[PDB]
Amino acid sequence: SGTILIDLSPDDKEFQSVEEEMQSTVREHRDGGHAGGIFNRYNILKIQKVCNKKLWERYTHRRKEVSEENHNHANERMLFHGSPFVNAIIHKGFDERHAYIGGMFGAGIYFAENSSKSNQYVYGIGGGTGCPVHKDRSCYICHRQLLFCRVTLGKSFLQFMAHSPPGHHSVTGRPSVNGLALAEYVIYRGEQAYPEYLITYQIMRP
Ligand SMILES: [Zn+2]
């Protein structure tokens, strides 16, 4: 592996930026905490910057290709990712080959602009079994991990699929009175995202 994790001082403005974004994007969900647990705040334990030259060159290369297909604009956004695979991803990069067939927008890798949404997916689809130790989707004890990722969206198709629709690079899923409540984002190519910050945390009891 080429990956090294550099720990950030809570003193650091880089930490405080990611901390602020994570806490501020939390929302009350429709499921009543069923999937991700009940909370309005996290206990931010550790923020590490992920450094891999090969993984970075994979990303910046793809980003250039998208820009030339999208009027010299990458449409780069910083978004959250949640999944069982976080420990794999920080070493090997995103891999679409492990994408899940069932999922509102087909076999892609899902992202959120709301940390609380991405949280729901950490122990699997709709929380799965919950935490390995207590089998509790609302565990306040077991430490969790999200990624705060640099994601190249390109020309994003809006919608309420194996790949992107033609002439598009992503899908922006959108709120729907009989569908989504917040925005999802989906890529169909692992090189269109970089896992930049690894966040270790727990959800807090009100
Ligand atoms: Zn637990």
Q: Any idea where the domains of the chain sit in the sequence?
A: 2-206
Structure determination technique employed = X-ray
Q: Ligand 1 centroid vs 131 CA: distance in angstroms? A: 5
Q: Ligand 1 centroid vs 62 CA: distance in angstroms? A: 38
Q: Say which amino acid occupies 6.
A: I
Q: Please check whether residue 73 is in contact with residue 131, taking contact to mean a CB–CB distance below 8 angstroms.
A: no
Q: Ligand 1 centroid vs 130 CA: distance in angstroms? A: 8
End-to-end, the C-alpha distance of the chain in Å comes to 40
Q: Ligand 1 centroid vs 133 CA: distance in angstroms? A: 5
For 2-206, CATH number out of 3.40.50.1360, 3.90.228.10, 3.30.1300.10, 3.40.1160.10 equals 3.90.228.10
Residue 51, marked binder: no
